[PDB]
Subunit: 291 residues, 7 copies
């Protein structure tokens, strides 16, 4: 913060009138509500002109049973990753200056235990017999404790021309069991990730986990909220800039099959990928952004 | 936020005088108090005119014993879902830009424990006999921890013309037991979701759980608090826009029957649906919203 | 909030506007109720309606009291199981109930699952040169449900555009590090021990009730409502006066203790008594004043 | 809050006006009470009534003290079981008690249910070719109750439109990692162990009382009230003067220790002594000043 | 707060002020005594205000004071820090307020009831078959609470005199205890500041290093107490004398050798260091001097 | 804070003062480093020196990658064990490094001691009228140490008045609910299991490395520095231009997996590769601007 | 705070224009970056002129293997205490008024548990034999819980002429073992504080704990952040004041030696002391501080 280096708070920041806007596009085939909120910041005391692009909207999860192959085997398509990406063409003079959020250093809680004890006893009965025991004990414990989200938010390695985030599936609770991930494997039941019952009396399709009891991101979807800061030199001859904005969904294939005794599930990674791209024009003189 | 990217706070946002209003309607048949609070925001430095629509009011729960087939079987209607939906006609130029709340990523706390120990003991009695014993142990522990609300609030997959929320029944604690949900099944007791006593001596209607010990959303109801942001192009020819708002309640059927040794309950999903729809007119020039 | 939708904070709210506020205080002696109405007239020209905020405060006494004493074997305690507040506009009124606070909040619960498994080896022996051996294994499944419970639940009753109300109801309560008990607790031997002081005692039934100092203060000293109701009124309306009835009421249960020649047993009758205190206020929207 | 009902925060409150404040200090020597009244006259023209905020502060000394000594087998300790502060308008007054802080809050408690079940297998053996085995199973169901309790409870007494008051009462207390004990704790051997230092030692009874340094600081050094009362006055009233009575009081219990020939036994008598300090203030609404 | 009674925040308070610093060092008593004062004269307030903040630092002076050979030694340590302000009785000015005050402690209590059943079947190669069916019940009570190394206590004030005492409560000793001034063990006595149970060194060596003990004991305690004094403007004598006293009470912790192990004994309130000083308050000039 | 020393907050900090800010961005492709400098010139007349605040941000890619594959029994994985950022002024410069953020924070640990003791009795018998009894006792002492560990530790390296720097180093990490492991973890059978996916599987060595999605995101996608350096300059200095070198660098370790005919065995070589990216900036104190 | 005594917040404080400055000096021999930030406050409504002296910079750890006596014995120098001291000459009329931080009162969490139980059991076998068992138990537990920092920050007993802080080594975790301090002793291992391995095959110098796994204060160093407030009477004749500032590092000597069966460590306290002093001139009239 500002006070940590003996300077009055808010002093070293960029603060000037700002020009803002909203641009909304809906991709029907890809089921993506894409909204770009932009702010043009022109601080004369700052050596660069700034454009802040906040990418919002919603990418639908589209957790859906897609095929029913008889009554033994059925297939479920589900979203394992949501991605948002911004890219400047290389010929551009404008640069990607900053981004939010970034990758945070995860933490874990470790705990070590040492217990030792002693115990004595006296025993007896009606035949006048009497016994005794003296025992001792030591025990060492190690406990690891940590928090994990259903989905991880990760900032991809940026350049000065391209940036992006991926919100990826980590693990999930299945009816107070698990947690399971894309790589969970059981010899009897295989991958129990979206498995409703271990054994029942129905067609395969019914045995998929009800999306209401799973992560709501899987079905109803994920709403990005990422910020990109682009800087522009005022003396450039060309005060126009193209920028590409991409929303993307990666879908995995979770299959259920019947092994004559119980259910077994199998998951194939990155089976499908829906990519929705749109190009925007940035006018640094007019301070407006269009598509 | 703005300070995370080296910019003065509150800079990049939309801020100008605002035109606000209230529209209240009460649907008696559906037992729904529907209130719409709206705000017209016209910032010249913003590329579009804004309308914020907050949908509030209260959808009654109407948790009730509706049928009485003697003293052996009875039926309880209960609300499993509350829904709010806003929809623009497709031919409209205005777009759904933003919404609150959105879907949150759940988290869970995991714990791993590894313990190992040793113990010794020496035994004896008055017959001069001496015994001895040396033992060792290892133990592995896994603990999963997470929070579940009685009802889940979910933002449905939006487009730029339609948006909505569903507040759905998740699971619920029943008199220090459970928690139970719509799919809980016990071979003896079936679904014990709203079952008061397992095997008492009363009529079936009496045996439903007192709403005072269940989620207050079930009976007294749920008060929506959702916001939609619509953007409008100032240069559009038609500066008038219709918008339809739907309130919905979906009720499940929980029936109790006596098996001569016990009570057993059965739950039918989405048996009834109360749907209350109203149309509003949005005048962007006059900056006023009416019904 | 506004910042969540890229708007300057406080932009979308009703404020730009002079407000006319007031206090009306009434004490109902027979019903033991202190009733305060704090009201605020907000007339924002940029708002499509006139606004009145009615904050219903004050305090409804608990009146937790031993009411009957049929000797030393039997006694009865009257206690408040519900506090209620209700506002109601007549149907012929043009003014509408627009909003209210508080509302019903969604409860949550903390769930915890444990799976533990272990092995142990062991060798035995003694002075007769004898040697024994032991290999054991174990597995264990644990499930924990965890949640917080208030002594009283605050509920917003199903509102209309003409009437609104809250009910603050008894939930459950700790009795001297035991329980918690509620209105429906039953023990075959002791019955409902909710306000039972001791299981065994040489003393009157009246003396065997739980000291109100050791119970929820809402039961005895009482509960102080803090509810807000927002009324909207159309400026074009012809009659710029609106009558409104405000009701405070208390529902009291009957908790009786009787001696079974060996011990104490408690019985609770629900909603035995109801104290209802109603009063009418006149809302003048032109004069921007509310009166009684 | 206001933002909860779509209104700019601080809009509906009384402030949108210059305030006249003051301090009145009195010390009751015989009753050991420092009594301070901080008052504020608020006259908001947009408010239908004049406001006086009376904040009652100061400190009521605990006066935890060994008062009598009957030999070395029996001794008595006076201790504060309740502090009380009360404000009362004469009924003939036109001014009304409008609001008060703090009020009674709804307590909560944390409940837990646990269900565990497990299995274990085991094989044992010997050098005599002997072979043994066992297969066991287990179920266990647990209930946990968890909650927080203060040493003293702060309670708002049932107010009227003329009188209000708070009481800070003794609840329970830890005694050297034991207990907690309260006024009704009883042990057949030791009686009430609340303020006894040792169970069995060789000293006078006076010696065996708990060092106040190891007890609640309120018991000895005392309690500092911080309560606010809000009085409303109609401007159109003929008599713009109002008398108001402010009362501080301390309730002391009698804790006796005696020797019973083998161990120590403690007994507590409730509400034996009561120190009450009353004073009258004159409220002049026109001059906007409060005097003594 | 004000918003709790439907009034705009900051309305009911007193809102130019004249402030000052007086510093004195008592070398003999090892006390750095600082008074920060503020004169507040609000026309809309019925009396003139003086806020007196008593700060500075009272050194702990945790030290081994005596060495009676190699079997016996004495440690002096601070069991109480005290601050006192006193107006003479004939003064018209009154003590109106003070901070901090005494807070009500809380404790966390939790009760558990567990009951279970267990079955088992046993057997061996001799075709023998055994069984057992068992049940269990258990009740647990848990008490939980937080206590500071020192308790900060506001002494019963009057309208002429006020004071605070910061007293030793209990303390952890090398992952053991906590111990207090009254802890007693029949073989070891009071193990409060004892380093080792049995080790061949001088008695002075066996005292706990101040670096592993509460820093208030050695380096000291910094008071931060405020007193609010009110004065009537119509008073004839617009001067007021006030005495401020800083105090340290030291206990005596003795270690002695019993030919097998160490034993500690603690005697309370053996020494008392009192540093008193008088200030002159001028309400007209709005200044406080010495 | 200032209020802690009886001064109005914000009084003693630096701030008629106008600040001259700017951004410099370069991307080193060979080293995969997005390097951004945000600078602020602060010239407070009431301050004895001109100030320049340099904020080093951007992102150093983790570049967690399988780099060699010697069949299906041996593979190598290059991973980032340290990220570093360094700023250096040449010796001949009169300008000085005055301050920096973050600095090294003091770690803490929670210690716990438990002492439990108990007694138990039991009576035994059977159908042969035999009667037995046993009475036992136990004592136990427990010590628990508890502390929080980040995946990477942020260290401020020992600064001078000419150069400053930070290193963000790998500490330890959880591997699929196992570990946590660090660069020196060793198992006689499995070696270092830090990034080992399975104990014994049937795949290529390359396929047996832990999925970067299940590892610290700093390892693959990378680390984003956020460091501040405060440089002071005398106004009276002759050369109001100052060169400064900024270095971003990544230290990569070598984690190899090999098959021992029964299972997998991991080996980690420290500081095998070092990627260094340096850039020269010109600081102009008169023109109040920074360039490269 | 002021609101605690019925006064508007910020009323009783000092506030006026302030004159601030920076003095940076680097002690190479002692490896100490020493920065002084000063603020002159002259409030006319305050009875004295104020100078706030903030001592910052960084004292390097210099955790280093210094000696090598073959391959069986070695020595490690480590910082056991960092110190900062400010001292006014006794003849000065200017006074040390205040200081931050001060000593905080530490706390601990104590909990006592009382548990008691009963159990029954019935036994039998195929020989028609019958057995019985009735048991009871009681147990009392005492648990202590508290937090201990790696280093303690302590304000030393100040006067009106001298003030200082010491940041001292408390204890430290050694590879999930310990924690150990300067007085830890094991008959077999001696002091295991900075010992890497109990018994291995390297030179002594190799067996010291990697500074990366120890407190970073030990190696990279400590950054002081201390404030001293000095008052000056405006009417004092001599409006100039010299002040000495001392930065100091106390290093302990941790030696490792091989006893032919395992490693044993020994630690000697306060072996070395690096002391770096600088004198500053305070001009109260010109409101400037120089070196």
């Amino acid at each position: 913060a500002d006070s940590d280096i003996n300077i009055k708070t808010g002093t070293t920041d960029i603060g000037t009138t700002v020009k803002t806007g909203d641009l909304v596009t809906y991709d029907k085939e890809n089921g993506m509500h894409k909204k770009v909120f932009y702010s043009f910041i022109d601080d004369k005391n700052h050596n660069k002109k700034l454009l802040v692009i906040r990418t919002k909207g919603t990418i639908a999860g589209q957790y859906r049973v897609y095929s029913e192959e008889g009554a033994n085997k059925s297939g479920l398509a589900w979203p394992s990753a949501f991605k948002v990406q911004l890219q400047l063409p290389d010929n551009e003079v404008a640069q990607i200056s900053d981004y939010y959020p970034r990758n945070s250093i995860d933490t874990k809680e470790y705990m070590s235990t040492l217990t030792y004890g002693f115990n004595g006893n006296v025993t007896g009965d009606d035949t006048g017999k009497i016994g005794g025991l003296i025992g001792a004990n030591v025990s060492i414990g190690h406990t690891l404790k940590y928090v994990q989200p259903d989905f991880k938010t990760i900032l991809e390695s940026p350049t000065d021309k391209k940036v992006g985030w991926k919100v990826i599936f980590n693990n999930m609770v299945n009816q107070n069991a698990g947690p399971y991930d894309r790589d969970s494997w059981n010899p009897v039941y295989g991958n129990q990730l979206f498995m409703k019952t271990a054994n029942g009396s129905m067609k395969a399709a019914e045995n998929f986990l009800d999306p209401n009891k799973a992560s709501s991101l899987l079905s109803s979807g994920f709403s990005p909220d990422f910020a990109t800061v682009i800087t522009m030199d005022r003396k450039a001859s060309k005060q126009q800039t193209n920028i590409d904005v991409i929303y993307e969904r990666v879908r995995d294939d979770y299959q259920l099959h019947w092994t004559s005794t119980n259910w077994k599930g199998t998951n194939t990674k990155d089976k499908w990928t829906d990519r929705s791209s749109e190009r925007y024009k940035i006018d640094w003189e007019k301070e407006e952004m269009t598509n």
